[PDB]
Amino acid sequence: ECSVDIQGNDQMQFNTNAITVDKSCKQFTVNLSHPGNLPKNVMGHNFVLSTAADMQGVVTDGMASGLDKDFLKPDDSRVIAQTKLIGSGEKDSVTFDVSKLKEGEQFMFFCTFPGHSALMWGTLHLK
Numbered sequence: 696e697c698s699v700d701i702q703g704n705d706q707m708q709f710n711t712n713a714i715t716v717d718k719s720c721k722q723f724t725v726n727l728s729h730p731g732n733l734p735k736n737v738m739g740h741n742f743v744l745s746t747a748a749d750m751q752g753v754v755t756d757g758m759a760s761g762l763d764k765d766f767l768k769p770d771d772s773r774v775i776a777q778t779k780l781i782g783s784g785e786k787d788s789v790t791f792d793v794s795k796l797k798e799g800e801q802f803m804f805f806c807t808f809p810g811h812s813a814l815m816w817g818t819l820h821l822k
């Protein structure tokens with residue numbers, strides 16, 4: 696209820712490709728964890744939400760803002776929600792206002808650690 700728990704693992708994958716957010720949620724929370732034993736600088740993960748059309752841009756630029764910036768460009772107005780980059784045995788969360796989701800989609804989530812978005816992406820939808 697108003698939350699989803701997402702794992703990114705040592706196999707460069709998330710546990711789901713699809714998130715639903717109920718419309719009667721004021722806020723929605725994403726809880727990210729990283730089971731496994733690989734460290735952040737070789738298999739780090741984060742959770743980033745944008746519109747599908749902004750995805751490409753957000754990724755290309757995170758790639759370059761580097762590891763210290765969570766592979767995210769700071770002040771990226773295109774990012775609706777984001778976590779920090781985490782490694783094995785770490786966690787992170789992000790809570791955001793569901794009004795930020797223009798009742799019209801289309802939204803995708805993904806990891807911006809370099810190369811990962813090939814495997815680590817999914818959809819988020821209202822309802």
Ligand SMILES: [Cu+2]
Nearest residue numbers: 740806808811
């Ligand atoms: Cu990743």
